Protein backbone atom coordinates (compact mmCIF):
# COMPACT_ATOMS: atom_id res chain seq x y z
CA UNK A 1 0.00 0.00 0.00
CA UNK A 2 3.02 2.25 -0.55
CA UNK A 3 4.26 6.62 1.81
CA UNK A 4 7.53 4.69 1.99
CA UNK A 5 7.48 3.42 -1.61
CA UNK A 6 4.99 5.89 -3.11
CA UNK A 7 7.23 8.93 -2.57
CA UNK A 8 10.32 7.14 -3.95
CA UNK A 9 8.52 5.89 -7.07
CA UNK A 10 10.01 8.65 -9.23
CA UNK A 11 13.45 8.61 -10.82
CA UNK A 12 16.33 11.07 -10.55
CA UNK A 13 14.29 13.98 -11.93
CA UNK A 14 12.33 16.17 -9.54
CA UNK A 15 9.60 16.94 -12.06
CA UNK A 16 7.33 14.24 -10.60
CA UNK A 17 7.17 15.95 -7.19
CA UNK A 18 4.21 18.14 -8.21
CA UNK A 19 2.23 15.22 -9.66
CA UNK A 20 2.82 12.96 -6.65
CA UNK A 21 1.78 15.64 -4.14
CA UNK A 22 -1.49 16.37 -5.97
CA UNK A 23 -2.51 12.70 -6.11
CA UNK A 24 -1.80 12.11 -2.41
CA UNK A 25 -3.78 15.18 -1.33
CA UNK A 26 -6.82 14.19 -3.40
CA UNK A 27 -6.76 10.60 -2.12
CA UNK A 28 -6.60 11.68 1.54
CA UNK A 29 -9.46 14.17 1.13
CA UNK A 30 -11.65 11.59 -0.63
CA UNK A 31 -11.68 9.17 2.32
CA UNK A 32 -12.24 11.97 4.86
CA UNK A 33 -15.36 13.24 3.09
CA UNK A 34 -17.12 9.85 3.08
CA UNK A 35 -16.26 9.09 6.71
CA UNK A 36 -17.33 12.47 8.11
CA UNK A 37 -20.71 12.36 6.34
CA UNK A 38 -23.58 10.06 7.26
CA UNK A 39 -23.90 6.77 5.37
CA UNK A 40 -27.70 6.94 5.12
CA UNK A 41 -30.38 8.95 3.31
CA UNK A 42 -32.49 11.23 5.51
CA UNK A 43 -34.76 11.00 8.53
CA UNK A 44 -37.75 13.03 7.27
CA UNK A 45 -39.88 13.02 10.44
CA UNK A 46 -43.29 13.19 8.76
CA UNK A 47 -45.19 12.11 11.89
CA UNK A 48 -44.55 15.43 13.67
CA UNK A 49 -44.57 17.68 10.58
CA UNK A 50 -48.00 16.98 9.06
CA UNK A 51 -49.83 17.51 12.37
CA UNK A 52 -47.95 20.72 13.26
CA UNK A 53 -48.15 22.66 9.98
CA UNK A 54 -50.97 25.15 9.47
CA UNK A 55 -51.48 24.36 5.77
CA UNK A 56 -53.37 21.13 5.10
CA UNK A 57 -51.64 18.48 2.98
CA UNK A 58 -48.38 20.45 3.02
CA UNK A 59 -45.83 18.25 4.79
CA UNK A 60 -47.35 15.04 3.38
CA UNK A 61 -46.77 16.00 -0.27
CA UNK A 62 -43.18 17.14 0.32
CA UNK A 63 -42.21 13.93 2.13
CA UNK A 64 -43.30 11.64 -0.72
CA UNK A 65 -41.32 13.53 -3.37
CA UNK A 66 -38.11 13.75 -1.32
CA UNK A 67 -38.08 10.00 -0.59
CA UNK A 68 -38.37 9.02 -4.28
CA UNK A 69 -35.49 10.16 -6.49
CA UNK A 70 -33.67 13.39 -7.31
CA UNK A 71 -30.57 14.67 -9.14
CA UNK A 72 -27.01 14.63 -7.85
CA UNK A 73 -23.61 15.77 -9.09
CA UNK A 74 -22.33 12.44 -10.45
CA UNK A 75 -20.60 11.19 -13.59
CA UNK A 76 -20.09 8.00 -15.58
CA UNK A 77 -16.99 6.04 -16.62
CA UNK A 78 -17.13 7.17 -20.26
CA UNK A 79 -14.30 9.73 -19.94
CA UNK A 80 -11.60 7.18 -19.13
CA UNK A 81 -8.66 9.52 -19.64
CA UNK A 82 -6.55 8.00 -16.85
CA UNK A 83 -7.45 4.41 -17.75
CA UNK A 84 -6.05 4.67 -21.29
CA UNK A 85 -2.90 6.45 -20.07
CA UNK A 86 -2.00 3.60 -17.71
CA UNK A 87 -1.63 1.08 -20.55
CA UNK A 88 0.43 3.46 -22.71
CA UNK A 89 2.80 4.38 -19.87
CA UNK A 90 3.51 0.73 -19.05
CA UNK A 91 4.58 0.03 -22.64
CA UNK A 92 7.36 2.64 -22.44
CA UNK A 93 8.41 1.98 -18.82
CA UNK A 94 7.42 -1.51 -17.63
CA UNK A 95 7.65 -3.21 -21.04
CA UNK A 96 10.82 -1.28 -21.95
CA UNK A 97 12.72 -2.88 -19.04
CA UNK A 98 12.62 -6.31 -20.72
CA UNK A 99 15.24 -5.16 -23.26
CA UNK A 100 17.16 -2.49 -21.29
CA UNK A 101 17.15 -3.58 -17.64
CA UNK A 102 17.29 -7.29 -18.51
CA UNK A 103 20.19 -6.77 -20.94
CA UNK A 104 22.32 -5.15 -18.23
CA UNK A 105 21.92 -8.15 -15.91
CA UNK A 106 23.02 -10.63 -18.59
CA UNK A 107 26.07 -8.56 -19.55
CA UNK A 108 27.17 -8.14 -15.92
CA UNK A 109 27.07 -11.89 -15.24
CA UNK A 110 29.17 -12.75 -18.30
CA UNK A 111 31.76 -10.05 -17.57
CA UNK A 112 32.28 -11.21 -13.97
CA UNK A 113 32.87 -14.84 -14.96
CA UNK A 114 35.28 -13.93 -17.77
CA UNK A 115 37.39 -11.51 -15.70
CA UNK A 116 37.76 -14.01 -12.83
CA UNK A 117 38.78 -16.94 -15.05
CA UNK A 118 41.32 -20.40 -19.87
CA UNK A 119 44.43 -18.23 -19.61
CA UNK A 120 45.35 -16.24 -22.73
CA UNK A 121 42.20 -17.40 -24.51
CA UNK A 122 39.97 -16.18 -21.69
CA UNK A 123 41.90 -12.91 -21.50
CA UNK A 124 40.81 -12.01 -25.03
CA UNK A 125 37.13 -12.44 -24.16
CA UNK A 126 37.61 -10.52 -20.91
CA UNK A 127 39.21 -7.64 -22.81
CA UNK A 128 36.02 -7.01 -24.79
CA UNK A 129 33.94 -7.28 -21.62
CA UNK A 130 36.17 -4.75 -19.87
CA UNK A 131 35.51 -2.19 -22.59
CA UNK A 132 31.76 -2.70 -22.28
CA UNK A 133 31.93 -2.41 -18.49
CA UNK A 134 33.92 0.81 -18.73
CA UNK A 135 31.42 2.28 -21.19
CA UNK A 136 28.53 1.29 -18.92
CA UNK A 137 30.12 3.13 -15.99
CA UNK A 138 30.39 6.34 -18.02
CA UNK A 139 26.82 5.94 -19.25
CA UNK A 140 25.58 5.47 -15.68
CA UNK A 141 26.76 8.96 -14.72
CA UNK A 142 25.11 10.45 -17.81
CA UNK A 143 21.81 8.68 -17.09
CA UNK A 144 21.64 10.26 -13.63
CA UNK A 145 22.54 13.69 -15.02
CA UNK B 1 92.61 -5.86 -11.72
CA UNK B 2 90.55 -8.14 -13.97
CA UNK B 3 89.90 -10.66 -11.19
CA UNK B 4 89.08 -7.93 -8.65
CA UNK B 5 86.62 -6.25 -11.02
CA UNK B 6 84.67 -9.47 -11.62
CA UNK B 7 84.35 -10.19 -7.89
CA UNK B 8 83.20 -6.65 -7.07
CA UNK B 9 80.66 -6.52 -9.89
CA UNK B 10 79.14 -9.86 -8.83
CA UNK B 11 78.33 -8.52 -5.36
CA UNK B 12 76.87 -5.29 -6.77
CA UNK B 13 74.69 -7.21 -9.25
CA UNK B 14 73.23 -9.31 -6.42
CA UNK B 15 72.21 -6.23 -4.43
CA UNK B 16 70.84 -4.52 -7.55
CA UNK B 17 68.69 -7.55 -8.42
CA UNK B 18 66.79 -7.25 -5.14
CA UNK B 19 66.58 -3.46 -5.60
CA UNK B 20 65.21 -3.73 -9.14
CA UNK B 21 62.60 -6.28 -8.07
CA UNK B 22 61.61 -4.15 -5.08
CA UNK B 23 61.35 -0.94 -7.09
CA UNK B 24 59.14 -2.69 -9.68
CA UNK B 25 56.46 -3.28 -7.03
CA UNK B 26 55.53 0.42 -7.25
CA UNK B 27 55.17 0.34 -11.05
CA UNK B 28 54.89 -3.17 -12.51
CA UNK B 29 53.15 -4.92 -9.60
CA UNK B 30 51.32 -1.70 -8.69
CA UNK B 31 49.49 -1.75 -12.04
CA UNK B 32 47.81 -5.04 -11.12
CA UNK B 33 46.71 -3.63 -7.76
CA UNK B 34 45.46 -0.46 -9.44
CA UNK B 35 43.55 -2.35 -12.12
CA UNK B 36 41.97 -4.64 -9.51
CA UNK B 37 40.83 -1.64 -7.46
CA UNK B 38 39.39 0.05 -10.56
CA UNK B 39 37.58 -3.14 -11.60
CA UNK B 40 36.11 -3.55 -8.11
CA UNK B 41 34.89 0.06 -8.11
CA UNK B 42 33.43 -0.33 -11.61
CA UNK B 43 31.62 -3.52 -10.57
CA UNK B 44 29.97 -1.74 -7.63
CA UNK B 45 28.95 1.14 -9.90
CA UNK B 46 27.53 -1.25 -12.50
CA UNK B 47 25.60 -3.17 -9.84
CA UNK B 48 24.21 0.08 -8.42
CA UNK B 49 23.17 1.32 -11.87
CA UNK B 50 21.47 -1.98 -12.69
CA UNK B 51 19.65 -2.01 -9.34
Nearest Cα neighbor of B38 from A120, A145, A133 is: A133
Experimental method: cryo-EM
* Pure H helices in A53-119: 59-66, 81-92, 101-115
Resolution of the experimentally solved model in angstroms: 7.8
Nearest CA in chain A to B51: A101
**Inter-chain residue contact B50 with A133, CB threshold 8 Å:** no
CB A140 within 8 A of CB B46: yes
CA dist B25 and B15 (Å) reads 16
Q: What residues in B contact A8, CB-CB < 8 Å?
A: none
Using CB atoms, which residue from A108, A115, A134 is nearest to B50? A108
Nearest to B46 by CA among A138, A123, A113: A138
Quick check: A114 and A125 in contact, CB under 8 A? yes
> Degrees (nearest 5) of the Cα angle B11, B17, B20?
140
User: Mutate which of B36, B39, B41 to disrupt the A interface (most A C-beta within 10 Å)?
Assistant: B39
Q: How far apart are CA B15 and CA B1, in angstroms?
A: 22
First to last CA, chain A: 30
Residue B42 is nearest to which of A105, A133, A143, comparing CB atoms?
A: A133
Q: Within an 8 Å CB–CB cutoff, is residue A140 touching chain B?
A: yes
Phi, psi dihedrals of residue A144, rounded to the nearest 5°: -95, -5
Distance separating alpha carbons of residues B9 and B2, to the nearest angstrom: 11
CA distances (Å), A60 to each of A46, A57, A69, in order? 7, 6, 16
Length of chain B in terms of residues written: 51
Residues with Cβ within 8 Å of A65's Cβ and at least 6 positions away in sequence, in order, are: none
Do A112 and B47 count as a contact with CB atoms less than 8 A apart? no
How many C-beta atoms surround the C-beta of residue B20 within 10 A?
A: 10
Asked if A41 contacts A32 with a C-beta cutoff of 8 angstroms, the reply is: no
- Cα atoms in the Cβ-side hemisphere of radius 13 Å centred on A50: 11
Report helix angle B28-50 to A120-143, nearest 10: 50
C-alpha–C-alpha distance, residues A52 and A38, integer Å: 27
Instruction: List alpha helices for B1-51, DSSP H.
Output: 2-23, 28-50
Distance CA(B32)–CA(B25), nearest Å, equals 10
Residue of A nearest to B46 (CA): A137
Distance of CA A67 to the CA centre of its chain: 39
Amino acid sequence: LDWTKIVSKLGLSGQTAAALTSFKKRNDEAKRILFELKQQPSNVDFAFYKSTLKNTAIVDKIQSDVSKFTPSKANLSKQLNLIESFEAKALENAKETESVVLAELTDLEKTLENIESXXXXXXXXXXXXXXXXXXXXXXXXXXXX
Amino acid sequence: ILLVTFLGFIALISKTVAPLYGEMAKNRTDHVVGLLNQARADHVNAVKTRI
